[PDB]
Structure 1
Amino acid sequence: ASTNLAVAGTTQVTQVDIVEKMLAAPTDSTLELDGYSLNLGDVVSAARKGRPVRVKDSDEIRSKIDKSVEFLRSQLSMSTEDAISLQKALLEHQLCGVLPSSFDSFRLGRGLENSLPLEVVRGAMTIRVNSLTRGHSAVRLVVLEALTNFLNHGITPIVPLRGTISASGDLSPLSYIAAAISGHPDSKVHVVHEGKEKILYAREAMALFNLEPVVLGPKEGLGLVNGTAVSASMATLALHDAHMLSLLSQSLTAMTVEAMVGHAGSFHPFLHDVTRPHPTQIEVAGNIRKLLEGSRFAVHHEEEVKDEGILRQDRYPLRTSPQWLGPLVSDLIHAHAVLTIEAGQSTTDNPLIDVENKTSHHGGNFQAAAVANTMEKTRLGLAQIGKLNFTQLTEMLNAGMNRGLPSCLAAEDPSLSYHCKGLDIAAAAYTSELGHLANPVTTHVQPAEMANQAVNSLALISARRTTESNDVLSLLLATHLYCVLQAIDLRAIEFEFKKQFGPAIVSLIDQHFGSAMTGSNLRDELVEKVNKTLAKRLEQTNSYDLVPRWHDAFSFAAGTVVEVLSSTSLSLAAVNAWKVAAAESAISLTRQVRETFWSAASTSSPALSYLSPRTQILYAFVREELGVKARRGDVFLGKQEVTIGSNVSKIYEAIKSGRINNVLLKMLA
């Protein structure tokens, strides 16, 4: 068992360290199970990535396994049909869950909703083997090999989704696994054969692979069916996914600060390391600080240090992000430590055999409360991440709050383009759904089995709900990522415009008013005050169409001219002429800057000029590798383009598949 905290789940280990180690798990080389070494990255590799799995090729391991079986046998001989019958009675009553009776009920894209996901089953078989290699259980090596042969030949039992309370542990689903390797006549398994997914009787599948059904002996029924492997499996997958979504939340925080031209100062070490040293608060601030280095969108503390109700500081979704995310990150790191012991270093069947002291012990290690605990806490965390990113996104999509970004992140006139409005509403919906999911399952314990099982963990049910919260959070975070990238591109257009328009203002002022200001000290003042009036006004006319927007801005500026140049000989006609020429100039320049953006490939986006080098990684991933482009607008284009949803879907799919995972790692390196 590893003492490296990056494996095992304090400032001496971080979520990024944990993720890096998980993502480094081999997928090609064989996972050798020894009862103690198995880690959560390994579990995910076997469950999801088809990694080969075997009991460690070791005389010590074999001898430990064999000696527990022998102990039981010899104890029995000193104290076989009926033992075989007892195991059959154990399976009989536990094969009691609901599955489709026939293929006749299957429909396109539907039909296996009442069965456990194949990956969960694979993860369960892996953990089950590991937990029996420890020598406490008296299950034969040939039985463990039956499981590893199922794994290595891609035979995955079809197991009901529901029916366990996760005490004598995950009895029912583990009984389906045991029935499958033993060739129960009514056991079904999933295989790929001749290029097709098939569901076959267990004996048919085994015959394709020349595998022999096992016949369960003394203690092997309880050895296989008592335990926590199914909930631990699903919980491990859910925690893996939650870690990624936590890192993505941090990344989206950074990109939002950039789109909002907000303050990187929120993440300064003084505000965390020095003043409020919660290790995971320090961690999160440091990740976001790292991501914002080099940004030309975010405002930097080290540069900053050089009667209107003016909002000068960022609102809480950005400014309190480390303080909001830190606590839940600590919970995810704690959960990692718990599940590592549970999945990798625990014997969870019963009774358990102490061969050295010739004793069989009656305990409770199948009570999966440690697993349920991780899932309750993680699901609440997912809801908290979701609330944060929703509040960041909805601020950014609010024209009144978003520091002058176009209404709805529309690229063209907002009168006929509401681009991200639907997504604002979707984000709300996902967030609401997360809130209800977050209520605990573990307060709903029933007096099961004649109250023998009066306390039961409900870990698998909890794991299921947390897996659904992962899914909903992925929809929300895919949505946010879609939006922030649009905002980044629109901000970059604003920056390109300002490069050209700053000089244009000065020039028009000189052309129109220079002679009237000759011999005065009015020019500096005028340029300064006209710029300030334009800036302040434009921030608030971000829902106006282009033409009236610019006439409005310069109308306001003309009032500033009246004041600043009130001593001069200028006619009202001359000031109005300046106003009109300046507005026309701004309107033309805007159109030209937009055309320069849209007429070139996304690989030439001006955003690449301003993004942090680290946040550019994620930008490039979505825009180039995923093909998700900025959206100019169906009405402007006179074309109903592939939908916003179709594009968000591509982001979501990259989250769910884990394609985005190495991207997050590279950014946070």
Structure 2
Amino acid sequence: TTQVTQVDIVEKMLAAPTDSTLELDGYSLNLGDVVSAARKGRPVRVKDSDEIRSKIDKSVEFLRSQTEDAISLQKALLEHQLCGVLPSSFDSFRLGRGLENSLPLEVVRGAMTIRVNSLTRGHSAVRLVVLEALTNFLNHGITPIVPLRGTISXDLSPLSYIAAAISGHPDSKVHVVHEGKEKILYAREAMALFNLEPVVLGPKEGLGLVNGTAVSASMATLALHDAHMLSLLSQSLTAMTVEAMVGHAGSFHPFLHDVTRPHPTQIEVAGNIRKLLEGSRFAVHHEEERQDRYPLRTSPQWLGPLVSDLIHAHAVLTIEAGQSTTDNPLIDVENKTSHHGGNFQAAAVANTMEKTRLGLAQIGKLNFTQLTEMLNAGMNRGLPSCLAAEDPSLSYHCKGLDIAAAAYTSELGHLANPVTTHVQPAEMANQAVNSLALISARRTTESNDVLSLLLATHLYCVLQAIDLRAIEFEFKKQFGPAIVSLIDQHFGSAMTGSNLRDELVEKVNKTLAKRLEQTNSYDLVPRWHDAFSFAAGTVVEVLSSTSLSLAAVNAWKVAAAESAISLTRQVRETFWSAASTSSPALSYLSPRTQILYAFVREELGVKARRGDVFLGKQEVTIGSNVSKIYEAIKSGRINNVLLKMLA
């Protein structure tokens, strides 16, 4: 639909407050909201309504009227569910290790937020003091430690650990930061510290808690949120690769989408890239009288299908996470009746994770092909061998990254296979079909991580590639006239009263380019002597009817190259002398892509790399720098940059 783009969605999510308290009313909770609560420690509370309180209280009352095994049964439903694996002791912990078998804290916080929001719909019949137990945990930084695996997503077990924690189970353990450091204390031990009192689960109040898809919906919401970002970064990387490659903006022309193949997201993607490329002095906007490969040229038709899936996933997950009661059985109250269904079958969130993971693998394949092309000397239209600043003979700057990019891409491929086709006949066959939503959600989450390493690698590389390209442009700017000059100083007199000027200038220059594009692997000196050497053979053809010794041309050849090698060395020192805030790239880069350049180059401190050898020094590794770009993506810091350049 040409109304609501991924960007609209990202801006909405990014607008979510982290300070103001989030109010759960059972219907307006959105994806940006759950993410702010899970990761940004946003305060959370069941909306101060009365309507909400009444329907809640009414649900409970309707049940009270239909005291013994009611509580006992709950204990029996919680017992068999606390069956997951977790480190038995703290002795197993090690530096940077220890909690691998536990669900990420943000997933648990997001799960509790979604758990409460749905219980406010007055269908579950669980006391308001129980929902409050959960919001207090969230507001006091108390997060239950729950096993990573064990659920088939009909999320009974992980949810039970949450219930056990609030109900103060003896073996229940929780996580919490106690001024300065983080600790893992027992449930009743943590609650004691914050003056919180353990709740006591009553009639059917246990199924109303352990039933549901809150844990899946939570991790899935975190994953879709991260994937949107990666999607927009991919598009930004495309625009910047079009620039570094000196490609064509025309592939993103409205006629090639809006008109001829009106897929709303093909239009959306082409529109975004078109926008990013506007005002670019790197990319080509017109031609007068040429190829440009699929990685760049077919990028909208490649990413477009993926984007609609991500937009679709967003529709599904906002309904799932903010407007659905996934418990069972459910009460109708106003109609005085209980219904037995299966709203706990998280096939909806599983379906979004399966589709997103395949999409994450398609985005990675696209960007990999663009990046590997740009890193291929015989394909990147002139750029230095491995994006090395100095002589390639002792510099292979990005070769390893080119390799790492393939490694990430391969892994995304395997990760992309479906999880939902591996359903087993669980629970004495009563749960013969289960969604496997959290397992799918977990796989998609790893794919986000792997794509992030790939895209952080691509960003690092294009930056370096456009700086180099900026250097080529600075050089060309001055060498263009210099060629004309050194020509006349050596041939003007050699032949006057002829047309041996406008022609020799046009053919020499046309021959120089032709050869220099497939000689970008040569070290500086040999490259230029090779260039004009070929250029000489061109003068011999235009100036056939002229009086000149072969030593009178060989002098023009050694002088032309000499100037080129001296020029190039000049432009280079100028660049490495000026701070990045003054980079020559900032005068060719589009105003919008210039925003990401500055973010990485200025705010993240990762600069262009000269080359250990040349510098005669081993500087902070490339990896240490890629790692910094990677971390900006995982923390989300880059999100606003992306929004700002695409808004």
Task: Please state how far the C-alpha of 1:219 moved relative to its aligned partner.
Answer: 1.1
- 1:612-654: per-residue Cα shift (whole Å, max 9, x none)? 0000000000000000100000000000110000000000000
- Percent of aligned pairs with the same amino acid: 100
- 1:365-404: per-residue Cα shift (whole Å, max 9, x none)? 0000000000000000000000000000000000000000
Separation in 1, partners of 2:559, 2:40: 64
- 1:111-164: per-residue Cα shift (whole Å, max 9, x none)? 000000000000000000001100001000000000000000000000000000
The 3-state SS of whatever aligns with 1:91 is helix
Alignment partner for residue 572 of structure 2, among 594, 599, 609? 594
Aligned length: 647
Task: Please state how far the C-alpha of 1:522 moved relative to its aligned partner.
Answer: 1.1
Task: Please state how far the C-alpha of 1:596 moved relative to its aligned partner.
Answer: 0.3
Separation in 1, partners of 2:499, 2:570: 35
Task: Please state how far the C-alpha of 1:600 moved relative to its aligned partner.
Answer: 1.5
Separation in 1, partners of 2:614, 2:180: 46
- 1:175-205: per-residue Cα shift (whole Å, max 9, x none)? 0000000000000000000311000000000
Alignment partner for residue 30 of structure 2, among 39, 42, 49? 39
Q: Which runs of 5+ in 1 are unaligned?
A: 1-9, 305-311
Task: Please state how far the C-alpha of 1:302 moved relative to its aligned partner.
Answer: 7.9
TM-score normalised according to structure 2 size? 0.99
1:236 alignment partner in structure 2: 221
Task: Please state how far the C-alpha of 1:359 moved relative to its aligned partner.
Answer: 0.5
- Give the direction of change, closer, same or farther, for the CA distance of 1:199–1:586 in structure 2 (3 Å limit): same
- 1:452-493: per-residue Cα shift (whole Å, max 9, x none)? 000000000000000000000000000000000000000000
Separation in 1, partners of 2:610, 2:149: 47
- Give the direction of change, closer, same or farther, for the CA distance of 1:261–1:163 in structure 2 (3 Å limit): same
Alignment partner for residue 612 of structure 2, among 612, 634, 641? 634
Alignment partner for residue 602 of structure 2, among 621, 624, 630? 624
Alignment partner for residue 54 of structure 1, among 42, 45, 53? 45
Separation in 1, partners of 2:175, 2:490: 80
The 3-state SS of whatever aligns with 1:516 is helix
Task: Please state how far the C-alpha of 1:301 moved relative to its aligned partner.
Answer: 3.4
The 3-state SS of whatever aligns with 2:561 is helix
Task: Please state how far the C-alpha of 1:169 moved relative to its aligned partner.
Answer: 3.0
Q: Are the equivalent residues in 1 in contact too, given 2:25–2:117 (CA < 8 A)?
A: yes
2:68 alignment partner in structure 1: 81
Alignment partner for residue 204 of structure 2, among 202, 219, 225? 219
Task: Please state how far the C-alpha of 1:521 moved relative to its aligned partner.
Answer: 1.1
Separation in 1, partners of 2:181, 2:617: 40
Separation in 1, partners of 2:146, 2:292: 50
Q: Which moved more, 1:514-523 or 1:144-153?
A: 514-523
Separation in 1, partners of 2:447, 2:300: 22
The 3-state SS of whatever aligns with 1:105 is coil
Separation in 2, partners of 1:196, 1:410: 44
Separation in 1, partners of 2:11, 2:578: 36
Separation in 1, partners of 2:447, 2:646: 24
Separation in 1, partners of 2:182, 2:352: 34
- 1:407-438: per-residue Cα shift (whole Å, max 9, x none)? 00011000000000000000000000000000
Alignment partner for residue 116 of structure 1, among 93, 100, 103? 103
Task: Please state how far the C-alpha of 1:356 moved relative to its aligned partner.
Answer: 1.0
- 1:212-263: per-residue Cα shift (whole Å, max 9, x none)? 1000001111000010000000000000000000000000000000000000
2:451 alignment partner in structure 1: 473
The 3-state SS of whatever aligns with 2:356 is helix
Separation in 2, partners of 1:327, 1:426: 27
- Give the direction of change, closer, same or farther, for the CA distance of 1:526–1:441 in structure 2 (3 Å limit): same
The 3-state SS of whatever aligns with 2:52 is helix
| Equivalent residue runs for 1:327-342 within 5 Å | 327-342=305-320
Separation in 1, partners of 2:176, 2:464: 43
- 1:557-597: per-residue Cα shift (whole Å, max 9, x none)? 00000000000101111011000011100000000000000
Deviation >6 Å, runs of 4+: none
- 1:8-48: per-residue Cα shift (whole Å, max 9, x none)? xx000100000000000011011000000000000000000
Separation in 1, partners of 2:104, 2:553: 72
Separation in 2, partners of 1:398, 1:194: 52
Alignment partner for residue 129 of structure 1, among 92, 102, 116? 116
Task: Please state how far the C-alpha of 1:517 moved relative to its aligned partner.
Answer: 1.9
- Give the direction of change, closer, same or farther, for the CA distance of 1:349–1:303 in structure 2 (3 Å limit): farther
The 3-state SS of whatever aligns with 2:183 is strand
- Give the direction of change, closer, same or farther, for the CA distance of 1:302–1:555 in structure 2 (3 Å limit): closer
Alpha carbon RMSD of aligned pairs, Å? Answer: 0.8
Q: Are the equivalent residues in 1 in contact too, given 2:154–2:431 (CA < 8 A)?
A: no
Q: Which runs of 5+ in 2 are unaligned?
A: none
Separation in 2, partners of 1:556, 1:208: 82
Alignment partner for residue 373 of structure 1, among 351, 354, 378? 351
The 3-state SS of whatever aligns with 1:103 is coil
Separation in 1, partners of 2:73, 2:305: 49
- Give the direction of change, closer, same or farther, for the CA distance of 1:302–1:398 in structure 2 (3 Å limit): closer
Task: Please state how far the C-alpha of 1:361 moved relative to its aligned partner.
Answer: 0.4
The 3-state SS of whatever aligns with 1:199 is strand
The 3-state SS of whatever aligns with 1:301 is coil
The 3-state SS of whatever aligns with 1:302 is coil
1:512 alignment partner in structure 2: 490
Separation in 2, partners of 1:74, 1:302: 81
Separation in 1, partners of 2:228, 2:441: 15
Separation in 2, partners of 1:86, 1:45: 36
Q: Are the equivalent residues in 1 in contact too, given 2:85–2:101 (CA < 8 A)?
A: yes
Task: Please state how far the C-alpha of 1:604 moved relative to its aligned partner.
Answer: 1.1
The 3-state SS of whatever aligns with 2:477 is helix
Separation in 2, partners of 1:468, 1:519: 72
The 3-state SS of whatever aligns with 1:595 is helix
Q: Are the equivalent residues in 1 in contact too, given 2:6–2:228 (CA < 8 A)?
A: yes
Separation in 2, partners of 1:175, 1:22: 30
Separation in 2, partners of 1:570, 1:289: 52
1:561 alignment partner in structure 2: 539
Task: Please state how far the C-alpha of 1:81 moved relative to its aligned partner.
Answer: 3.1
Separation in 1, partners of 2:587, 2:330: 64
Separation in 2, partners of 1:470, 1:549: 42
The 3-state SS of whatever aligns with 1:32 is strand
2:255 alignment partner in structure 1: 270
1:456 alignment partner in structure 2: 434
Q: Are the equivalent residues in 1 in contact too, given 2:118–2:323 (CA < 8 A)?
A: yes
Task: Please state how far the C-alpha of 1:303 moved relative to its aligned partner.
Answer: 7.9
Separation in 1, partners of 2:108, 2:351: 21
The 3-state SS of whatever aligns with 1:408 is coil
- 1:314-368: per-residue Cα shift (whole Å, max 9, x none)? 1000000000000000000000000000000000000000111110000000000
TM-score normalised according to structure 1 size? 0.96
Task: Please state how far the C-alpha of 1:599 moved relative to its aligned partner.
Answer: 1.3
- 1:262-302: per-residue Cα shift (whole Å, max 9, x none)? 00000000000000000000000000000000000000138
1:6 alignment partner in structure 2: none
- Give the direction of change, closer, same or farther, for the CA distance of 1:137–1:303 in structure 2 (3 Å limit): farther
